[PDB]
Amino acid sequence: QSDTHIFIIMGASGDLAKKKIYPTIWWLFRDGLLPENTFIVGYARSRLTVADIRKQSEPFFKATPEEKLKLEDFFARNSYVAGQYDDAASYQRLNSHMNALHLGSQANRLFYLALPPTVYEAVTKNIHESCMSQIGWNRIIVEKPFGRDLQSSDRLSNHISSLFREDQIYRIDHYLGKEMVQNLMVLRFANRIFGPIWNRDNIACVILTFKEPFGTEGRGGYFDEFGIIRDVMQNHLLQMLCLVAMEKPASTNSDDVRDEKVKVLKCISEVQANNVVLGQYVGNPDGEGEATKGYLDDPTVPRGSTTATFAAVVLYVENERWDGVPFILRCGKALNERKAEVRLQFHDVAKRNELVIRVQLNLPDAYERLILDVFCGSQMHFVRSDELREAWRIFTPLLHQIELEKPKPIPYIYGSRGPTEADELMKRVGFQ
Amino acid sequence: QSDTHIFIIMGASGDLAKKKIYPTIWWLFRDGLLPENTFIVGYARSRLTVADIRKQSEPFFKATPEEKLKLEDFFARNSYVAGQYDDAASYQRLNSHMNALHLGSQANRLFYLALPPTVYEAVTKNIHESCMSQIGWNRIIVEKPFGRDLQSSDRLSNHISSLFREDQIYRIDHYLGKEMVQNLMVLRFANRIFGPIWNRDNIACVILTFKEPFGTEGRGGYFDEFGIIRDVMQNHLLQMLCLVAMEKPASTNSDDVRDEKVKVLKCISEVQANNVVLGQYVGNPDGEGEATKGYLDDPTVPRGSTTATFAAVVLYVENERWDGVPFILRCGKALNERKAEVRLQFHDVAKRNELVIRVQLNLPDAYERLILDVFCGSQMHFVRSDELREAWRIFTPLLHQIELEKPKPIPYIYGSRGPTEADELMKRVGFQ
Ligand SMILES: NC(=O)c1ccc[n+]([C@@H]2O[C@H](COP(=O)([O-])OP(=O)(O)OC[C@H]3O[C@@H](n4cnc5c(N)ncnc54)[C@H](OP(=O)(O)O)[C@@H]3O)[C@@H](O)[C@H]2O)c1
Ligand SMILES: NC(=O)c1ccc[n+]([C@@H]2O[C@H](COP(=O)([O-])OP(=O)(O)OC[C@H]3O[C@@H](n4cnc5c(N)ncnc54)[C@H](OP(=O)(O)O)[C@@H]3O)[C@@H](O)[C@H]2O)c1
Structure with a gap:
């Protein structure tokens, strides 16, 4: 809806975030495929700095000495907010931090739930009441397992869709090959x-x-x-x-x-x-x-x-x-x-x-x-x-x-x- | 139209006859795919006997010691008539020889022109007037080249089709692979x-x-x-x-x-x-x-x-x-x-x-x-x-x-x- 995008990685300290999420957004930013004005904000309970995330995730970046300028720019657009997944004050801190970024009050917000679905109910609630953009669009990316049967999936999905429209729900599935x-x-x-x-x-x-x-x-x-x-x-x-x-x-x-x-x-x-x-x-x-x-x-x-x-x-x-x-x-x-x-x-x-x-x-x-x-x-x-x-x-x-x-x-x-x-x-x- | 078939190999002394024609009719007879009452009659100018054709063609038969009984039966059904390709008396000898075979007067006749098309005009003429069956069907198999351009092909084809109906003309083409x-x-x-x-x-x-x-x-x-x-x-x-x-x-x-x-x-x-x-x-x-x-x-x-x-x-x-x-x-x-x-x-x-x-x-x-x-x-x-x-x-x-x-x-x-x-x-x- 505009030019400014915020990429929130809920659970940025995790395995998918370190081995796959951060590397691929690196690759998209490096090849000029992300929007020009993009910010990357990690969120998890563990008290980390962007330096920590870089230390533990750049091994998977395929970072070459030619690229170390766009790489420094990429990590310049990176920030990390620590907080609990059901603490209102924590999401308040996250939301106000996003608001502090350049044009953040009106940027599109893309929440990617790198988290075990056991916490989804909490996260989707707090996001819904604390961190959605008033001007830009808000798109959530949920991750497998989408439940394990009709009943469990129905419960989780009915919860998520009572807070977000279907054109805000992106159920991503990407573990069976690069093609x-x-x-x-x-x-x-x-x-x-x-x-x-x-x-x-x-x-x-x-x-x-x-x-x-x-x-x-x-x-x-x-x-x-x-x-x-x-x-x-x-x-x-x-x-x-x-x-x-x-x-x-x-x-x-x-x-x-x-x-x-x-x-x-x-x-x-x-x-x-x-x-x-x-x-x-x-x-x-x-x-x-x-x-x-x-x-x-x-x-x-x-x-x-x-x-x-x-x-x-x-x-x-x-x-x-x-x-x-x-x-x-x-x-x-x-x-x-x-x-x-x-x-x-x-x-x-x-x-x-x-x-x-x-x-x-x-x-x-x-x-x-x-x-x-x-x-x-x-x-x-x-x-x-x-x-x-x-x-x-x-x-x-x-x-x-x-x-x-x-x-x-x-x-x-x-x-x-x-x-x-x-x-x-x-x-x-x-x-x- | 009945049970008795005669397979006339016009030009039986040639290369296609020795390397391909005789071997494949061998293989069809051996595998029980020819009609039960089939006779094979070769025809060419060179004065040969069935023994000569066998001597020069069995190398290509893939003949195994198990098969030497059906092979003797196969060559028992074989005969050879020598004659010229434009001599009326020669075709008279061929026709009367076919008539002498068991049920030959009324057997189907299959003429296979293992001959350079330069002689086709003569052969197709004499067959038409001397060797066609009065009761059984008569099918000719012509061989490439079917002319080399529109004019030459038109001349050859107009000649052949003025003597035989299209359901008697089989233009065979089989040199580009077993499939x-x-x-x-x-x-x-x-x-x-x-x-x-x-x-x-x-x-x-x-x-x-x-x-x-x-x-x-x-x-x-x-x-x-x-x-x-x-x-x-x-x-x-x-x-x-x-x-x-x-x-x-x-x-x-x-x-x-x-x-x-x-x-x-x-x-x-x-x-x-x-x-x-x-x-x-x-x-x-x-x-x-x-x-x-x-x-x-x-x-x-x-x-x-x-x-x-x-x-x-x-x-x-x-x-x-x-x-x-x-x-x-x-x-x-x-x-x-x-x-x-x-x-x-x-x-x-x-x-x-x-x-x-x-x-x-x-x-x-x-x-x-x-x-x-x-x-x-x-x-x-x-x-x-x-x-x-x-x-x-x-x-x-x-x-x-x-x-x-x-x-x-x-x-x-x-x-x-x-x-x-x-x-x-x-x-x-x-x-x-
Ligand atoms: N084939 C598949 O189906 C497949 C494959 C890979 C990943 N996934 C999905 O992708 C998501 C990513 O998981 P992951 O394997 O990358 O790493 P993870 O270790 O499962 O979770 C990453 C972060 O989640 C938080 N976390 C984990 N368990 C928690 C709990 N019980 N309570 C609260 N917070 C908890 C931790 O954050 P902090 O401690 O820093 O707060 C951790 O750093 C999951 O939803 C998983 O199902 C699916
Ligand atoms: N890819 C292709 O297009 C292809 C490949 C192979 C064969 N063919 C065709 O298949 C046929 C078989 O020919 P071939 O290669 O197997 O052998 P061939 O040597 O061309 O002819 C076989 C017999 O034809 C007779 N003959 C040859 N030239 C003659 C002439 N100028 N005048 C009279 N009689 C003559 C001889 O019989 P006698 O001396 O015993 O009387 C000879 O034994 C030909 O029509 C040829 O075009 C086509």
């Missing part, structure tokens, strides 16, 4: 191109694959609280299912395409376990390196974890365009290849023919694109509240059943394609 | 699928590529009489252009799809040299093997040959479906890869996006499929007389101009992608 956004871009373009062809008349089966050849790598502890369905399927694979199956949007506005994605989701009924194959990866005896260790051989994984690191799930969009057309979401860690593709198999009328939309994967690198998008106000690659609600609805009964009965996942060897029962499922619903 | 027919099959299937999408509205440019990484390999002598346009472009690339651009056929009959191919061809006007880039390959100094030798370093190439071994040509289908959409035919010998693909570039509305139809290339192996097709009467992968006429019309003025002015082709290094002027042409008509 994460190009995926969705080319899928949208393919939907626009092949729209007339993507019917139940030509397509017999659609599959959506996310394979990674590496394991949890000494961090199975974190992953174990969530599982492969919450990690990849409920968020990303389901988004690209939407992009494939959606109708033509009314325009190219973010909210028209998001309307169409939500319409697609509202046609998918809840998945039962008979259409689900879960798997856990064991160590490769003959391989070397991390391939020798399995999932339970990760020290951070609790003994007896039935958490699935691989899942194959069958969903159905139930409308006139798609009916009985199976959408097979297959994903897993510690597999044979690093592939993220979408294959559509065609009704033979003559070996079955399929159209493959693959995203070659080894300027902005998806995360940088999302920050720039919140700066520009483009909400397209951010999940909407109703979209998120529908995703959780689709997957919550299954997740509850898994947590309740704890079915032992099928073992598969590190570097394999996964359980053969997943191939069994695909064949059972009709594939080849 | 030559799968190419056209998947292209037809793609036309059927993406029909509604393939418009001037979505497509900005279509390219059709035939690259080979090997040179002429000590046989530039033969190739030099024809050139890369007659060798690859006027026949194969143009056929697959037709398969891409055609309307939906009235049915799946061979003649309906061939009607649509001819309709496409009748919309392409003659190509002038300003849309043509010709190239000749020179030896790679730093490479090794045959890559050190160029085209003129082939001993069988006459000194000073301006024959092009690479060509990039732009054609336009002129109808409502395609208008100003450039079809770029690019092909050459001694290049960087062995690739045969069709790329369709799309109108961006956002780097340009293209749909790639590639044919993976390293049961029947295309040649075997064509022989089986003539046995079954499927004319689909054989060029029709009007289709051939249109191809020659499109390319004859350019070929005449090349033969008349002898433009020196652009040199390109063995293993290169070819002349940069071809990239210039593609860019000039709009590509990236």
